[PDB]
Amino acid sequence: MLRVYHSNRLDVLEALMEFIVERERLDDPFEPEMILVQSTGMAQWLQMTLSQKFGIAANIDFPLPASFIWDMFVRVLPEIPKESAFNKQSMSWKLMTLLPQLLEREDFTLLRHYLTDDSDKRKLFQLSSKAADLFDQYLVYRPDWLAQWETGHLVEGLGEAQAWQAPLWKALVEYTHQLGQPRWHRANLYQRFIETLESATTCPPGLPSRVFICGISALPPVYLQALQALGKHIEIHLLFTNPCRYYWGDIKDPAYLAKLLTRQRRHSFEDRELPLFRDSENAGQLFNSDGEQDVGNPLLASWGKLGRDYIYLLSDLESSQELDAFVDVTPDNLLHNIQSDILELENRAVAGVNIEEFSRSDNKRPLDPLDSSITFHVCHSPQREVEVLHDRLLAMLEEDPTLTPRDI
């Protein structure tokens, strides 16, 4: 069972992780606890909060999502090396050898005009590094393109660069077939990894008891389709921070809108069913013809496109369990007003479409002049900017008696 934990802030997710660890203890003490993070400061803050909550924080592994996915590839499917043969530097050094061999082809006349003018083996290495970075991005994000390029068939609807990218990739796959290096990579393995977990009867050995995903707000659909097959057997708790409590993503089809309407979240402690949309009868009028929801808040619609795609990718999972733990914020300050307008998904920006809305101004929210929550400062130089910032931080430390510089 894959559990999804929607929350407004990260302290509620840390308390939920504390309740999950204190509720279910690990049967193997030396088994490391996999918590997936993106940066080192996120893992450091998670270690500090778990040490402050439990009294200790040890044997907690913080790998990359790609490293954890390759480790699960090694543990589930055998005959796989510990390191991937298809890396950025390895594909760059392979393509630096393969690109002069492919200059005789007719499809590589553009690279021949780019390379054979003047080359002291500098443009070739930069081209190989950029093409290896693009091939790594194709290994992460676009496995069907590489799967069709390995056969030799083109994809309809792409650009002109595929005309030099399709024979370059396939001759790479033969090249590692020519050497002693293994064949397997990230693209061709994920489908067999998904199929071998659904087709299996018992759980494979070597898998961890529970995996946490905290601080990660962006994942490819390939990684989510692998993690769904992992969550079918082993309980994986997903901690995702979303600023809005309602549904603020996109839609695919009207047959998918009813499937999203049938799915309802439930609270962790209150245990009450809560719907996604604020209005169920008017939920069809919010989405456009292409499938984009007309969000009333312009800041959430203009800034959080990555989270808008990520909540649509999370809602697309079939066996996902969605739990919502949102702590409401009382709108008293300006910053709390902004956070309440984002969380409650309402539009407080008064346009003034009529003359009665344009003449009166008391229909907006009152802002006290002593409210120093959100301030905008205009500076003249980078020295004077942080010189003003130091004085303002000293004023904030003098105004609040209980204020830690670690919290700044």
Partner: protein
Amino acid sequence: AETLDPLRLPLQGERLIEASAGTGKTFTIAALYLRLLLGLGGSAAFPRPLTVEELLVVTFTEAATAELRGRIRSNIHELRIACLRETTDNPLYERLLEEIDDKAQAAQWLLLAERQMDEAAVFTIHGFCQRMLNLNAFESGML
């Protein structure tokens, strides 16, 4: 020579605008930017409306490009407000509002322009040349 109207300029082929000293050149550039964004002019209009990432503005001085980008952003916000309210205090903005028949689609296009103003193609000469050399490096032969 002929006089220049910002709402009657045919945006086809090559046109040469001679803006004298002291004239509102920075206002005329923003007016033509709004004209290219909304697709106005009728018979002398563009065949299709263009986005923010397709309008190229070339000015040599970098502070002039920053001031022009800020003025174009302010004009986009003012025209979005005047299109949402169907009224304005400027006569050129009044003729701009009178030239369009639809109000919701123009307001949505101006909102998308306000959201995509960060990715605007308002560069200098050498900046645009460096961007074209780095983007299409195959035909040029640039590192």
